Design a protein around this ligand. Structure first.
Ligand code: 16A
Length: 30
């Protein structure tokens, strides 16, 4: 779990890009 972690690394970053959906969401309702 090297390329496991570097998976759940790039999981977190591309859930980054999810939140920054829910950014552009807030600014959808604006
Ligand atoms: C917008 C949603 C995209 C999500 C991106 C996540 C894809 C991750 C791609 C995996 C890359 C694998 C590279 C091979 C790694 C080899 N070692 C980990 C063993 C060094």
């Amino acid at each position: 779990q090297x390329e496991x972690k570097l998976x759940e690394x790039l999981x977190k970053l591309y859930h980054x890009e999810x939140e920054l959906x829910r950014x552009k969401x807030l600014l959808x309702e604006x």
